[PDB]
Amino acid sequence: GRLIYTAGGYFRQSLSYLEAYNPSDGTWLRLADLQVPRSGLAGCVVGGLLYAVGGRNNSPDGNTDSSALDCYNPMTNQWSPCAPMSVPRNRIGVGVIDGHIYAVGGSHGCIHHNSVERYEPERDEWHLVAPMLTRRIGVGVAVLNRLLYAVGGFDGTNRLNSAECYYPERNEWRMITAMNTIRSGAGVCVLHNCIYAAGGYDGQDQLNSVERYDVATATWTFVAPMKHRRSALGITVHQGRIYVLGGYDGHTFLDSVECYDPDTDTWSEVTRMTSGRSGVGVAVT
Numbered sequence: 001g002r003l004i005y006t007a008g009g010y011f012r013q014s015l016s017y018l019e020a021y022n023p024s025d026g027t028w029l030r031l032a033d034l035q036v037p038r039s040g041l042a043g044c045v046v047g048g049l050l051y052a053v054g055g056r057n058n059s060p061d062g063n064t065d066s067s068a069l070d071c072y073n074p075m076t077n078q079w080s081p082c083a084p085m086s087v088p089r090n091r092i093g094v095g096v097i098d099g100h101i102y103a104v105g106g107s108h109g110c111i112h113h114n115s116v117e118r119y120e121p122e123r124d125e126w127h128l129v130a131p132m133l134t135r136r137i138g139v140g141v142a143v144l145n146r147l148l149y150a151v152g153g154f155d156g157t158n159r160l161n162s163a164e165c166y167y168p169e170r171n172e173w174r175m176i177t178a179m180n181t182i183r184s185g186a187g188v189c190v191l192h193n194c195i196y197a198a199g200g201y202d203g204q205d206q207l208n209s210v211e212r213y214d215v216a217t218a219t220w221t222f223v224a225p226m227k228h229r230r231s232a233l234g235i236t237v238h239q240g241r242i243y244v245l246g247g248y249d250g251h252t253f254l255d256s257v258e259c260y261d262p263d264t265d266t267w268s269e270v271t272r273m274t275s276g277r278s279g280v281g282v283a284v285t
């Protein structure tokens with residue numbers, strides 16, 4: 001029994017919701033709220049524990065970028081603060097290699113990070129690794145073949161279609177084949193040995209197109225687009241299918257949850273979140 005967890009998000013302000021969807025029965029569980037509301041965060045799982053990394057708390061009073069790492073234990077329904085990152089990272093990308101969390105790019109006020117840092121749960125420590133070749137906020141991150149890919153985003157001047165790859169044993173980055181579409185705020189994940197980039201913002205419009213990167217051929221190929229255009233969507237893989245949760249379509253904050261079946265190349269609306277929101281952190285455990 002694995003659930004799709006959605007943490008935080010944004011609807012008029014940053015949210016503290018932690019909710020879990022069971023794809024087997026269509027139920028949503030209302031779990032313990034985050035101690036501090038956040039949007040632009042990312043979720044991940046290490047050893048059955050859920051992590052909420054970075055983001056920003058936007059309130060009608062003022063906004064605060066987060067360098068926080070918080071840990072949720074599904075067995076206790078309790079959040080526990082962990083060591084914070086070296087810098088606040090809003091609109092962050094996260095990836096897990098060998099039970100180590102990589103926090104990629106993101107923004108802190110006027111700053112757009114190229115810096116990347118790694119968290120070791122067993123030591124409760126963060127350490128900087130080699131920075132990316134490009135500054136990237138709203139960056140999609142995927143782990144494939146024990147390599148950490150940074151896909152698209154925004155370098156502070158332009159939205160990007162470029163993508164790069166990190167070699168943890170060598171501690172270095174290399175640019176890979178760029179996507180067909182410029183995407184900032186896309187949902188990036190790996191399914192069946194392919195990296196998928198769904199939705200995002202091309203600098204003018206929110207996207208519904210979805211493309212996948214094949215490593216053997218080094219080519220990005222378009223697959224069936226989602227029914228709803230969305231940027232700042234949450235994304236995860238569950239039982240061989242991609243799930244996209246919420247997002248922003250340019251006017252409204254989506255509650256729509258779509259599911260991609262790779263065997264039939266089709267998307268379908270599987271459920272709706274309890275309320276519309278963008279900038280959620282998603283993970284499965």
Ligand SMILES: CC(=O)N1CCC[C@H]1C(=O)N[C@@H]1COC(=O)c2cccc(-c3cccc(C(=O)O)c3)c2CSC[C@H](C(=O)N(C)C)NC1=O
Nearest residue numbers: 010039040058091137138154184185201231232248278279
């Ligand atoms: C103008 C603006 O962005 N805002 C002013 C008040 C605070 C802030 C505000 O509304 N943010 C909330 C939160 O959104 C995310 O968490 C979030 C999380 C991850 C990625 C992205 C993302 C997507 C596309 C491109 C880029 C890129 O970096 O180029 C980044 C976002 C921003 S989605 C845009 C939408 C918006 O602009 N309006 C006006 C509601 N913003 C949001 O949903």
Ligand SMILES: [Cl-]
Nearest residue numbers: 039040056090
């Ligand atoms: Cl924001």
